[PDB]
Amino acid sequence: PEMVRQVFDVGPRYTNLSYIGEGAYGMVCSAYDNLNKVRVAIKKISPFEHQTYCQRTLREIKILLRFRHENIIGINDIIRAPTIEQMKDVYIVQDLMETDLYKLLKTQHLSNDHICYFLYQILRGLKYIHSANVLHRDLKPSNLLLNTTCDLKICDFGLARVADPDHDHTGFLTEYVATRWYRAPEIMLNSKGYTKSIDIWSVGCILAEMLSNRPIFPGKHYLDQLNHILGILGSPSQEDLNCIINLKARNYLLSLPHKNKVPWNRLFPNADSKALDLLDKMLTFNPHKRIEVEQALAHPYLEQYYDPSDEPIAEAPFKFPKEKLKELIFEETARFQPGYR
Numbered sequence: 554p555e556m557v558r559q560v561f562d563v564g565p566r567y568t569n570l571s572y573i574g575e576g577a578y579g580m581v582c583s584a585y586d587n588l589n590k591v592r593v594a595i596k597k598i599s600p601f602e603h604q605t606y607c608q609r610t611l612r613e614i615k616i617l618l619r620f621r622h623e624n625i626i627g628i629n630d631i632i633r634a635p636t637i638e639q640m641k642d643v644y645i646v647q648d649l650m651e652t653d654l655y656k657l658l659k660t661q662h663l664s665n666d667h668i669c670y671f672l673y674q675i676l677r678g679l680k681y682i683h684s685a686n687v688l689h690r691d692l693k694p695s696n697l698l699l700n701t702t703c704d705l706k707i708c709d710f711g712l713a714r715v716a717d718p719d720h721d722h723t724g725f726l727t728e729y730v731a732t733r734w735y736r737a738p739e740i741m742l743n744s745k746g747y748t749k750s751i752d753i754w755s756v757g758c759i760l761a762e763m764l765s766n767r768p769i770f771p772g773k774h775y776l777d778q779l780n781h782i783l784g785i786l787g788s789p790s791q792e793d794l795n796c797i798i799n800l801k802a803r804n805y806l807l808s809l810p811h812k813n814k815v816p817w818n819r820l821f822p823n824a825d826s827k828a829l830d831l832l833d834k835m836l837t838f839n840p841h842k843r844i845e846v847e848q849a850l851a852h853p854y855l856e857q858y859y860d861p862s863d864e865p866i867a868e869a870p871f872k873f874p875k876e877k878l879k880e881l882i883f884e885e886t887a888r889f890q891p892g893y894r
């Protein structure tokens with residue numbers, strides 16, 4: 554097999570490998586697809602020693618083999634050994650993009666037109682995801698891929714779940730859904746992250762970061778995150794506190810000194826006022842008052858792009874030991890075997 558930095562065993566269809574970045578359970582390489590005559594991205598996955606790794610791998614494969622959308626990076630091919638006995642790694646082949654938004658924001662200032670088009674595409678893909686009754690649950694700049702003409706695709710469905718709003722409530726300081734800087738305040742207070750509003754919060758964080766090239770809520774550790782959120786939003790209203798029935802969470806908030814809201818136009822003095830109006834609606838403390846994806850698409854900031862007939866939804870929404878998970882991954886990837894069927 555061809556090797557990179559480890560086995561990267563994708564041949565002979567895929568050749569001339571170059572290291573790019575990293576997935577969760579392995580490295581990402583670009584490669585030349587000798588059949589389609591285009592370069593592609595390939596993610597190496599080694600999940601089978603651990604249930605949780607197997608879960609995340611299987612979840613993504615199940616979701617992406619059903620999803621088809623311009624703003625979601627799909628699965629082009631899956632490479633693995635012909636038998637469960639010989640299967641150790643799994644390689645997922647996807648479109649080769651130019652960069653991710655994390656890397657881009659490290660050095661490039663976005664024009665307002667770029668922010669608008671990027672945000673439109675994030676929400677257009679998110680509309681499709683949410684219409685399938687699925688939550689991405691880890692939206693962040695490094696999961697947003699851009700090609701050379703600034704078309705955007707959402708990556709990594711390994712953390713996704715089927716939405717379950719009726720079972721979303723939990724206790725205080727127990728949940729860790731999403732990546733810290735993009736994590737909604739209710740995750741720390743009373744939410745398992747099973748409602749669509751979790752993703753809208755993350756998109757609001759991404760919008761703020763596109764406006765200034767810095768994370769808006771850069772918590773330095775799990776417990777610091779809520780300090781940053783409340784430092785900008787200010788103290789929650791009585792009505793929003795009354796919506797938090799859990800006593801530990803509500804009394805924690807009641808114990809805090811009053812904090813003023815920081816106006817968005819003072820944080821972002823060069824931003825488009827329509828962008829800040831939408832930002833405010835996405836970064837609303839109360840998840841029931843937070844804007845939903847279809848409302849966000851219809852917001853005046855996005856009026857140059859908004860077209861509900863060109864914002865498709867999913868045809869087939871989702872309704873609901875590692876040894877069996879390995880077997881399930883083997884079965885779910887069978888369609889890509891050369892002599893599959």
Ligand SMILES: *[C@H]1CC(=O)[C@@H](O)[C@@H](O)CCCc2cc(O)cc(O)c2C(=O)O[C@@H](C)C1
Binds near residue numbers: 574577626
């Ligand atoms: C996309 C999700 C993922 O694994 C994240 O860690 C991303 O940040 C990794 C991005 C790798 C990458 C980088 C470039 O420049 C281009 C492309 O196409 C990718 C890519 O496709 O990725 C996916 C394999 C994973």
